[PDB]
Design a protein around this ligand. Structure first.
Ligand SMILES: [Ca+2]
Ligand SMILES: [Ca+2]
Ligand SMILES: [Cl-]
Ligand SMILES: [Cl-]
Length: 113
């Protein structure tokens, strides 16, 4: 047509919360800094790139599991064809700030149960 004014679709994005005391679960949550808590880990899946983030008060078990979830998306869902970027509070890649916007101060979240 003569005039193309409708925005194109952008790549699907997902965010997982990686949380637990010793039984650690990955739960899909809304893609927003409001999902983030400094007590847990988060996996921001941007398709060809996956951002693995752990908070300063995340526990060992969560950090281990975050590695498994990112690798698992890459390997089981992307056929190995994706880049994992590991970051932490305050070291987030620009690509993650582009998606989530400027980073606010983050709360601790709920104790793991
Ligand atoms: Ca936690
Ligand atoms: Ca705790
Ligand atoms: Cl056209
Ligand atoms: Cl990177």
């Amino acid at each position: 047509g003569s005039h193309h004014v409708v925005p194109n679709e952008v790549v699907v994005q997902r965010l997982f919360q990686v949380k637990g005391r010793r039984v650690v679960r990955a739960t899909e949550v809304p893609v927003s800094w409001e999902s983030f808590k400094n007590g847990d880990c988060f996996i921001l899946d941007l398709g060809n790139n996956i951002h693995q983030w752990c908070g300063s008060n995340s526990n060992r078990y969560e950090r281990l599991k975050a590695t498994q979830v990112s690798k698992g998306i890459r390997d089981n869902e992307r056929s190995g064809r994706a880049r994992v970027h590991v970051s932490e509070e305050g070291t987030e890649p620009e690509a993650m700030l582009q998606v989530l916007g400027p980073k606010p101060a983050l709360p601790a979240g709920t104790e793991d149960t």
